[PDB]
């Protein structure tokens with residue numbers, strides 16, 4: 509008998525540092541005054557209010573956020589992040605909150621690329637550290653292209669216009685949203701490499717944050733707010 513408090517005081521109201529991507533619409537992006545908005549931002553904020561925690565959002569970029577989690581610089585991340593078996597070796601994920609995949613894209617009007625078989629001799633780009641980048645490595649010899657990587661979306665999308673790349677790979681719902689946003693894109697082929705998005709923490713860390721995210725997510729699904737948030741961007 510070394511002592512025990514029979515009146516636990518809850519850790520409610522805890523403020524967590526949460527990393528996210530710089531721009532990854534419709535999941536996170538900024539409005540005209542620089543405020544972060546998007547499906548991920550809204551889901552997280554609604555969950556945080558439901559579960560009585562606070563968020564300090566740290567826009568870092570995708571790979572930068574991944575490395576910040578592993579370096580214990582931030583508590584969690586939400587960044588349209590695919591749950592994968594390999595990532596589960598170093599991250600703990602929430603329940604899934606979106607079904608996604610990858611999409612090949614070229615500049616609008618580029619009739620020279622209508623299939624993956626048309627990538628021979630071309631340069632194809634993706635964002636560093638992403639499922640798209642991994643897909644490019646896996647398929648490089650198969651379709652005989654050269655790879656470029658960019659740190660974030662700004663470089664990746666500029667690449668189709670400035671001579672750097674003939675094609676890019678990015679997430680399917682992001683490219684669909686970009687086409688609807690009037691960007692000069694042509695989508696090629698269908699969804700590849702299905703995955704679902706989760707909130708993430710470093711493996712073995714912040715288990716309460718995962719528990720709260722999962723509870724909040726279920727509550728938003730049950731009460732209709734999940735569906736409304738998605739429709740606010742995807743309708």
Ligand SMILES: NC(=O)CC[C@H](N)C(=O)O
Pocket residue numbers: 529532570587588589590591635637638639640679
């Ligand atoms: N924000 C992103 O670019 C994420 C891309 C992809 N879903 C991944 O998890 O790698």
